[PDB]
Amino acid sequence: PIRALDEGDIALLKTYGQSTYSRQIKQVEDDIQQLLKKINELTGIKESDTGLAPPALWDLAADKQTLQSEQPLQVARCTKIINDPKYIINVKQFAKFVVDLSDQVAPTDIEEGMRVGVDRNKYQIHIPLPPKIDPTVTMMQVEEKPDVTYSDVGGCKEQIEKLREVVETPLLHPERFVNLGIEPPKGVLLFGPPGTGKTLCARAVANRTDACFIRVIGSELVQKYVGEGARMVRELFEMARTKKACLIFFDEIDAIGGARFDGGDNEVQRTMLELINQLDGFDPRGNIKVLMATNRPDTLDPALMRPGRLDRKIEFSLPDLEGRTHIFKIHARSMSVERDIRFELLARLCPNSTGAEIRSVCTEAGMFAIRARRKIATEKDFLEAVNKVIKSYTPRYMTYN
Amino acid sequence: VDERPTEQYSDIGGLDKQIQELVEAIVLPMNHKEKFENLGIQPPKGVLMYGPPGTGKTLLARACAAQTKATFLKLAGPQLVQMFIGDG
Amino acid sequence: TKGPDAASKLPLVTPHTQCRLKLLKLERIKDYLLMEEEFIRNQEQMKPKQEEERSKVDDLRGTPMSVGTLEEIIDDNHAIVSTSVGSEHYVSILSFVDKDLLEPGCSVLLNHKVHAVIGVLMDDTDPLVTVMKVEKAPQETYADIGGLDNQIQEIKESVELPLTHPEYYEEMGIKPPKGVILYGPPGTGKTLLAKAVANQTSATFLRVVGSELIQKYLGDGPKLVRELFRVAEEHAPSIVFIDEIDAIGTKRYDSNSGGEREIQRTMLELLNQLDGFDSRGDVKVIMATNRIETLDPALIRPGRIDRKIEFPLPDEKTKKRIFQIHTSRMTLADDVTLDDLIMAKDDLSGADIKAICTEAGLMALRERRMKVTNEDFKKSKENVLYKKQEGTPEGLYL
Amino acid sequence: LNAKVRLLREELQLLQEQGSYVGEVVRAMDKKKVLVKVHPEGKFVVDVDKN
Numbered sequence: 001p002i003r004a005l006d007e008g009d010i011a012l013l014k015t016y017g018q019s020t021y022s023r024q025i026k027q028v029e030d031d032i033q034q035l036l037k038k039i040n041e042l043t044g045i046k047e048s049d050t051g052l053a054p055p056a057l058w059d060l061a062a063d064k065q066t067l068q069s070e071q072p073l074q075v076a077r078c079t080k081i082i083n084d085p086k087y088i089i090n091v092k093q094f095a096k097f098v099v100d101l102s103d104q105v106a107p108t109d110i111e112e113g114m115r116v117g118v119d120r121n122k123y124q125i126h127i128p129l130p131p132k133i134d135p136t137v138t139m140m141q142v143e144e145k146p147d148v149t150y151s152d153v154g155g156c157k158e159q160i161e162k163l164r165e166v167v168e169t170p171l172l173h174p175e176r177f178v179n180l181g182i183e184p185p186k187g188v189l190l191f192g193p194p195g196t197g198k199t200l201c202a203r204a205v206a207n208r209t210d211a212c213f214i215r216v217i218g219s220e221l222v223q224k225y226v227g228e229g230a231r232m233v234r235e236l237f238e239m240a241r242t243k244k245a246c247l248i249f250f251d252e253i254d255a256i257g258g259a260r261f262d263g264g265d266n267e268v269q270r271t272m273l274e275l276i277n278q279l280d281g282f283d284p285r286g287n288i289k290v291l292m293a294t295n296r297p298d299t300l301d302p303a304l305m306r307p308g309r310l311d312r313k314i315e316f317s318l319p320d321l322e323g324r325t326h327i328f329k330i331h332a333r334s335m336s337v338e339r340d341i342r343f344e345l346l347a348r349l350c351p352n353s354t355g356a357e358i359r360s361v362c363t364e365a366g367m368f369a370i371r372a373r374r375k376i377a378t379e380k381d382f383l384e385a386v387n388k389v390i391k392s393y394t395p396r397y398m399t400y401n
Numbered sequence: 402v403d404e405r406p407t408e409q410y411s412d413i414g415g416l417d418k419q420i421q422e423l424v425e426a427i428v429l430p431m432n433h434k435e436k437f438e439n440l441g442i443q444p445p446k447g448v449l450m451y452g453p454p455g456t457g458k459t460l461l462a463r464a465c466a467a468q469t470k471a472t473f474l475k476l477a478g479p480q481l482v483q484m485f486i487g488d489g
Numbered sequence: 490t491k492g493p494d495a496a497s498k499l500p501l502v503t504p505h506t507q508c509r510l511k512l513l514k515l516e517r518i519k520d521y522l523l524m525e526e527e528f529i530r531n532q533e534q535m536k537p538k539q540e541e542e543r544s545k546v547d548d549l550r551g552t553p554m555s556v557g558t559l560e561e562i563i564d565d566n567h568a569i570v571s572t573s574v575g576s577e578h579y580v581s582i583l584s585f586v587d588k589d590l591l592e593p594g595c596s597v598l599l600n601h602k603v604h605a606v607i608g609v610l611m612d613d614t615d616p617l618v619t620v621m622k623v624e625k626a627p628q629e630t631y632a633d634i635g636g637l638d639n640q641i642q643e644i645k646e647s648v649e650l651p652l653t654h655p656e657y658y659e660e661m662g663i664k665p666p667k668g669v670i671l672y673g674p675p676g677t678g679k680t681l682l683a684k685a686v687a688n689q690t691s692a693t694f695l696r697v698v699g700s701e702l703i704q705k706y707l708g709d710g711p712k713l714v715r716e717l718f719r720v721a722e723e724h725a726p727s728i729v730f731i732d733e734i735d736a737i738g739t740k741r742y743d744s745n746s747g748g749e750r751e752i753q754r755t756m757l758e759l760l761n762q763l764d765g766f767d768s769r770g771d772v773k774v775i776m777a778t779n780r781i782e783t784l785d786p787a788l789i790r791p792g793r794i795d796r797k798i799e800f801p802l803p804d805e806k807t808k809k810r811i812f813q814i815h816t817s818r819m820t821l822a823d824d825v826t827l828d829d830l831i832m833a834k835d836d837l838s839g840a841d842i843k844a845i846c847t848e849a850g851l852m853a854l855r856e857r858r859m860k861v862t863n864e865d866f867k868k869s870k871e872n873v874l875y876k877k878q879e880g881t882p883e884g885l886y887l
Numbered sequence: 888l889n890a891k892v893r894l895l896r897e898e899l900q901l902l903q904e905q906g907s908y909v910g911e912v913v914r915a916m917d918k919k920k921v922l923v924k925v926h927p928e929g930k931f932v933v934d935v936d937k938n
C-alpha cells in the first residue's frame with residue numbers, strides 16, 4: 001500500500017518547512033567549496049625542488065662549453081681482445097660490437113673484462129672505467145652503528161655467548177681457534193618466538209662488529225626481472241669477499257628461503273639456490289660470517305638449514321625468571337620508577353612473555369603513571385600494566401589454587 | 402677452476418661405492434678411452450649426484466676436481482638464468 | 490627535514506542547526522576565502538635579476554628532460570647514469586647541480602640529447618604511494634563518535650598526545666606507543682576512530698587498504714611497502730593507517746603458491762619496516778581488522794602493535810550515545826522514546842544504530858512526514874536488523 | 888567545390904604531421920613543466936603548450 005512520491009509532494013517537502021535560512025546556508029556552503037577549489041587551482045603548484053645549487057656555486061658560462069665539447073659515452077665491457085688490435089665490447093643490452101680504441105687511450109690500458117666507455121656513433125673505446133660497484137648492494141651496508149649494545153640484551157647470556165663465538169670471537173682472536181685446530185662456525189640462525197630479541201642481538205653485533213656489517217634487505221633480493229635476485233645475491237657475496245672479515249645479516253630469511261616445491265615462487269627459489277651455493281659448495285665462501293634470523297624456522301629449505309651454511313642454530317627461547325627480571329631492569333633503567341618496585345613479582349606475573357611484551361608492559365606502566373598526573377610510576381601501575389598487556393590479551397582460575 | 406681446490410678421497414668417508422662409481426664413470430673413460438673402445442662398452446655421458454642434503458655430493462665433486470688432471474668447469478643452476486632472452 | 494604535510498581543513502561551524510549564527514559563521518569563512526582569492530589574484534596582476542640565471546639554466550637544460558637513475562659518481566664532474574631503458578651512459582655533471590644530493594640510487598634529471606646531468610629529482614615518489622596521502626581531512630571528528638571513550642583515550646595516547654605533549658613521555662622515560670591495532674565486530678567504530686584521528690591530527694596521514702600494498706609483479710609489493718614507509722618518514726610526524734590488515738596479515742604458513750609466498754613476503758617487509766634493523770622513526774601505524782585471531786603473531790606482537798584496542802558491540806550507554814549522535818540532525822517527534830529500541834537483545838552495532846536512523850527517516854518520507862515518530866523507528870528496526878540468521882542455541886540451558 | 892577541395896587538402900596536410908606520444912602524468916612541477924611517463928620509455932619532464 002506504500003505510495004510513490006510525486007513532483008508536487010517533493011516540492012512541498014523541500015519548501016514546506018525551513019526556507020528562511022536553509023537556501024542561504026546551502027548556497028554559502030556550495031560557494032565556499034567553489035572558492036576553496038578556485039584558490040587551490042590558482043596556487044596549485046607546490047614547486048617541486050630540483051638539485052639547483054646556490055647561484056654563486058655554479059655561475060658558469062663554460063658549462064655550455066663542456067656540454068658542447070664533451071660527449072656522452074656508453075659504458076660497455078670488453079669481453080675479448082683481438083690481435084691493429086680489435087676489441088669485442090658488450091654494450092650492456094644494446095648489442096655486441098667489435099671496436100678499436102681511440103687515439104686518446106693506449107692499448108695497454110684496456111684489458112679483457114674491463115668496462116670501458118664508447119662513443120654513441122662509432123662505438124670506439126675512449127676511456128676506461130672503474131669496475132661496477134652496485135648501488136643497491138653498496139647501500140645494503142650499515143656504515144652507521146645502531147645504538148643498542150649487548151648490555152641492552154638480557155636473559156640470553158648463553159645465546160649471546162654463542163653468537164659472539166660465531167661472529168665476533170673468530171674475527172677478533174683467530175689464535176684461540178687456530179691453535180687448537182678449530183674452524184669456527186661461519187653462520188648463525190637465530191630462530192625463536194617473535195619479539196624475543198634476535199634482531200636486538202643482531203643490532204648489538206653490528207654495533208660492536210668492528211668489521212663490515214651488511215644488512216640484507218629481503219625486498220631487494222626479490223627483484224621483478226628473472227635472474228635479478230640471484231645477481232644481487234652474487235654481487236653482495238662478491239662485495240663481502242672484497243672486504244676483510246665481513247658480516248652478512250639475512251634478516252627474515254623465511255622471506256626468500258622457502259621450501260622448494262614443484263610455477264610457484266620459482267624466481268625466489270632460484271635466488272635461494274644462488275645463496276645456497278655461495279654459502280657452501282665449490283669456491284669456498286671465505287671470511288663471511290652469515291647471520292640469519294627467522295621466527296618460523298620450519299618453512300626453510302633443508303639445504304639452507306643444513307649445518308654447513310648455518311653452522312650454529314641458536315634458539316631464542318622465552319626468558320626464564322632471571323631473564324625476565326634482567327629484561328625488566330634493562331627496560332626500566334630510564335623509567336622514573338619508585339624504589340620499592342618488586343621486579344621479581346612482575347617477572348613472575350608474566351609467565352610466558354618475550355622481551356617485547358616486557359617492554360610493552362613497561363611502556364603501559366609509564367602511560368598509566370602519565371594518565372593520573374604522577375611523575376613516578378608506582379608498583380600498582382606496573383601491576384595494572386601487566387593485567388592490561390598479558391592477562392587482558394576468573395571461573396577458569398577458580399579450579400586452580 | 403684455476404685455484405685447484407685440494408680434497409683427497411680419504412677426506413670422503415662412508416661413500417666408497419659412490420666414489421668408485423664416479424671415478425669409473427667420469428675419470429676412467431676420460432684418461433683411458435681407447436681401452437673402453439676396445440671392449441665396445443659405451444661410457445655414460447654424465448653423472449647425476451642425487452641424495453638428501455649434506456650427503457657430500459659437492460664434496461665428491463671437489464675431490465674429483467682436485468684428484469683429476471681434467472679441466473674442471475664448475476657452474477651453478479642460478480648462474481644459467483639471465484633476464485635477457487637467450488642469455489642462459 | 491621535510492616537515493609534516495598535514496591535510497588542509499576549514500574550521501568547524503558549531504550551530505549545525507540552520508540558525509542565523511551558522512549563516513554568520515559561514516559568511517565569515519566565505520569572506521576570508523574571498524579575501525585570500527582577491528589577495529592572490531592581485532599579487533601577480535599587481536606585480537610588475539634572477540631572470541637571466543633562470544633563462545641560462547633552462548636554455549642549458551633544454552626540454553624534454555629525461556629522468557634516469559644515477560649508478561655511480563666517478564669524478565666531481567662525471568657520473569654514470571643508467572637511462573630508463575637500462576642502458577648506462579657516462580654523462581657529464583654540469584655545475585648547476587648540488588653535488589651533496591647526488592648519491593647512488595637517486596633519480597637524476599638528464600639532458601635529452603647529450604644526457605649530461607642537469608638536476609636531481611627530489612620527490613620521485615611512486616605514484617601509487619602519493620595517492621595514499623590524505624589531503625582533504627574527513628569531516629568526522631571525535632564528537633561524531635558515541636562512546637568508545639576508553640578506545641578514544643588509548644588512540645589519543647598512541648597517535649595524538651605524543652605529538653602535542655611529548656613532555657610527559659620524555660620525563661617518564663617511556664617511548665610513546667607507536668603502534669595500535671583496532672579489532673572488533675564489523676560496524677563498531679574502527680574506521681571512524683581512524684577518520685577522527687586523521688581529522689584532528691596535525692601529522693601527515695597515510696591511508697592504505699591492505700589490498701593495494703599487493704602488486705601483481707613479484708618485487709613490487711615489498712618495494713611499495715618500503716616506498717610508503719619512506720614517504721611516511723620523510724614527513725617526520727606521520728600516522729599510517731592500514732585498514733583491512735587481515736588482507737595481507739594472515740598467519741604465515743608453508744604455501745605451495747607464489748601468490749601466497751608473495752603475500753607473505755609483503756607481510757614480512759611490512760613487519761621488518763615496523764620493528765626491525767634500523768629504528769622506525771616517528772611513524773605511527775594504525776591497523777583495523779574484524780578478525781585478529783587470523784593475524785600473524787609477529788605482526789601484532791608488542792613493539793609493532795603496542796595497544797590492541799578492542800572495539801566491542803555497543804552497550805546500552807554507548808547505544809544511547811550513537812542514537813543521540815545520529816539523530817541530532819533529524820527532527821524527532823515528542824513520542825520518540827529511543828530506549829525501546831536501545832534495549833535490544835545484545836547485537837545492535839553503530840552501522841545499525843544509523844541505518845535504523847536512515848530507515849526511520851525514509852519511512853517518515855513515505856508517510857510524507859519530515860518528523861519521525863516511534864512507529865517509524867520500530868518499523869525501521871524490524872526492517873534493518875535482519876542480519877544474522879540464527880546465531881543462537883536451542884532451549885537447552887536453563 | 889572549393890570548400891571541399893580545401894577540406895581535403897587540409898586533411899592531407901594534417902595527416903603528414905607526426906603522431907604524438909601518449910603517457911601518464913605524475914605531477915606538475917613548476918607550473919611550466921610536467922613529469923610524464925611514456926609507455927615504453929622512462930619518465931620525462933616536459934613543458935606545456937600555450938593553450
Ligand SMILES: Nc1ncnc2c1ncn2[C@@H]1O[C@H](COP(=O)(O)OP(=O)(O)OP(=O)(O)O)[C@@H](O)[C@H]1O
Binds near residue numbers: 193355356
Ligand atoms: N631479550 C630482550 N631483552 C631486552 N629487550 C628485548 C629483548 N627482546 C626484545 N626486546 C625489545 O623488543 C624490541 C624488539 O624485539 P626484536 O625485534 O629483537 O624481536 P625479534 O625476536 O627479533 O622479532 P621477530 O622474531 O619478529 O623478527 C627490541 O628492540 C627490545 O627493545
Ligand SMILES: Nc1ncnc2c1ncn2[C@@H]1O[C@H](COP(=O)(O)OP(=O)(O)OP(=O)(O)O)[C@@H](O)[C@H]1O
Binds near residue numbers: 280415454
Ligand atoms: N660422506 C662424506 N664424507 C666426507 N665429508 C662429508 C661427507 N658428507 C658430508 N660431508 C661434509 O659435510 C658437508 C656436506 O656438504 P657438501 O659440501 O659435500 O655438499 P652437498 O653434500 O652436496 O650439500 P648440498 O646438498 O647442500 O649441496 C661438507 O662440508 C663435507 O665435507
Ligand SMILES: Nc1ncnc2c1ncn2[C@@H]1O[C@H](COP(=O)(O)OP(=O)(O)OP(=O)(O)O)[C@@H](O)[C@H]1O
Binds near residue numbers: 637674843
Ligand atoms: N560508535 C559509533 N559512533 C558513531 N557512529 C558510529 C559508531 N559505529 C559506527 N558508526 C557509524 O557507522 C559507520 C560504520 O562504522 P565504521 O566505519 O567505524 O565501521 P568499522 O568498524 O570500520 O567496520 P568494518 O569492519 O565494516 O570496516 C561509521 O562510519 C559511522 O557513521
Ligand SMILES: [Mg+2]
Binds near residue numbers: 198199765
Ligand atoms: Mg626481527
Ligand SMILES: [Mg+2]
Binds near residue numbers: 281459
Ligand atoms: Mg652441491
Ligand SMILES: [Mg+2]
Binds near residue numbers: 679680681777
Ligand atoms: Mg573499517
